[PDB]
Design a protein around this ligand. Sequence first.
Ligand SMILES: COc1cc2c(cc1O)CC[C@@H]1[C@@H]2CC[C@]2(C)[C@@H](O)[C@@H](Cc3cccc(C(N)=O)c3)C[C@@H]12
Ligand SMILES: COc1cc2c(cc1O)CC[C@@H]1[C@@H]2CC[C@]2(C)[C@@H](O)[C@@H](Cc3cccc(C(N)=O)c3)C[C@@H]12
Lengths: 277, 278
Amino acid sequence: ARTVVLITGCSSGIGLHLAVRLASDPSQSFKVYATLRDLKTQGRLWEAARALACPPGSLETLQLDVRDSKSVAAARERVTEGRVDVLVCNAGLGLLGPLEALGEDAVASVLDVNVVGTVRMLQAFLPDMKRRGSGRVLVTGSVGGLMGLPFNDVYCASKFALEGLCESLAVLLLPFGVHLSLIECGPVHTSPEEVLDRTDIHTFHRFYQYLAHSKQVFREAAQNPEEVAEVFLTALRAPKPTLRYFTTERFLPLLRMRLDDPSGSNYVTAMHREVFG
Amino acid sequence: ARTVVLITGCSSGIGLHLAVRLASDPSQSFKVYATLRDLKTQGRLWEAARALACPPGSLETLQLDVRDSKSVAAARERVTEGRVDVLVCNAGLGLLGPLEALGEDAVASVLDVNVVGTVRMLQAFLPDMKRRGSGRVLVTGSVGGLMGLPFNDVYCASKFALEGLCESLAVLLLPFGVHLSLIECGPVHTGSPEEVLDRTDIHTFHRFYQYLAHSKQVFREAAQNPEEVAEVFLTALRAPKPTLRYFTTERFLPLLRMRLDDPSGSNYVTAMHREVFG
Ligand SMILES: COc1cc2c(cc1O)CC[C@@H]1[C@@H]2CC[C@]2(C)[C@@H](O)[C@@H](Cc3cccc(C(N)=O)c3)C[C@@H]12
Ligand SMILES: COc1cc2c(cc1O)CC[C@@H]1[C@@H]2CC[C@]2(C)[C@@H](O)[C@@H](Cc3cccc(C(N)=O)c3)C[C@@H]12
């Protein structure tokens, strides 16, 4: 039969592009369930699917809010085939700021969505994969999950968390026939009085230095979602897929140098200089 | 003046033994605020302090629940000296089982306590350290935050989270003179099988008790004491130029190097599976 794929966060960005890219495969091997936090936002997804003339029956949309395990469960049941062959945990939020400037609500939401939401997906869907003896799981990773970056403290915390969660599972799942892969993405194309009042003069200084230098890095390094989507394909098609795929080699140098020094301090020293000019 | 230390998770283990070790230090240079989630658990802390002769005013206990930022705020207000010279973020939960067997609340708890709790600590205490231009933060870390282990998926997520949190901060804090360190602990010596089986398949049930048996042999061979771990905290406190990571044992550095050698993660997964399961 068709390979059944379920992808979260499908309304914009990487999810959309992967969803339509699989639905329009001319072998037409893929039945795609594209899931969205709000089904009302699906319009843009359907336009891109028409533009590739996705055969009807190749792409179905569901509501799936990863904060809520009832919405996760309900979505699992809407998979009328009664299996998922490829699960793509892509739903994620950002958070940028001096740590002490972030509300408690915001910090928790990032963790609730990027980490706990991924745990909910895996809890719902891994058992049937394990029963069948096969399955693929692809998780939207970050270079931020491999190296820490100033003012992304909670974001990197959630992406590092995904590394640990997915690496922990992969060790168990290898002989269950289930293959877990992280797609490590770099950047992807898609008042100040407050900051000062909630921080201090030096932190405030370093944050606008950061926002300025960061924008230069996206301009050079940012990838289009369609390019990243291809990396998911490669992983998906790989016969013996590996734990990580990098969408770019741009940060292998800083990554190798981070791994040279266990104490951590060369990474901190270098990253500081490189970020703060 | 003495060095003001505030430590979370002092009812037992690393927090209790480090707290009494510093308050009883022969220097007499430490004033320790040993904090606890529930004050009723302070029994073993006081008996230990009594046993090591902590002098008057070397040790005070505060109720502090890392889940509750008003608790954290109230604790900060009880620091009479108006500053903390060493903050130790040691409060933490374990969680051990097949991922599908763990309850959603327990999962949410580990994260709230190990990761958001630490964030709340750093929110409440880093600013004053930043504007002073001085401070040391020590965070209890794990080798489980550096490499993933089967059936420790959520615990590892949480420890990995701390690595990212702390490393992101360290890049910022370098010119402030506020030093952040992770004390990377290996095993330290301090779900009902029923519930587990219901929620997991048969092969995973077996694999888990296979993991538990190997685990108990690793703990027997290689576990450290809280007393031994507490020395590494103290070495890090005193270091003139502290590093981001202190390892309590050298034992896992080989595996860690292998993990880092192969960025694709393939080698680690094979090796760790064999290591754990044969
Ligand atoms: C050393 O090179 C640098 C890399 C970087 C910066 C600055 C540098 O000097 C700032 C952006 C950051 C990159 C490295 C790669 C990073 C970590 C990417 O994976 C990006 C992760 C990211 C993407 C979108 C939102 C967020 C967020 N809200 O925090 C975070 C942000 C990127
Ligand atoms: C590399 O060889 C091994 C190391 C290990 C094991 C099995 C191995 O084959 C199983 C236990 C584990 C050690 C490596 C270091 C580990 C991960 C330590 O950090 C321990 C962490 C730990 C302690 C207490 C509870 C929990 C938890 N999941 O709640 C986790 C548990 C240790």
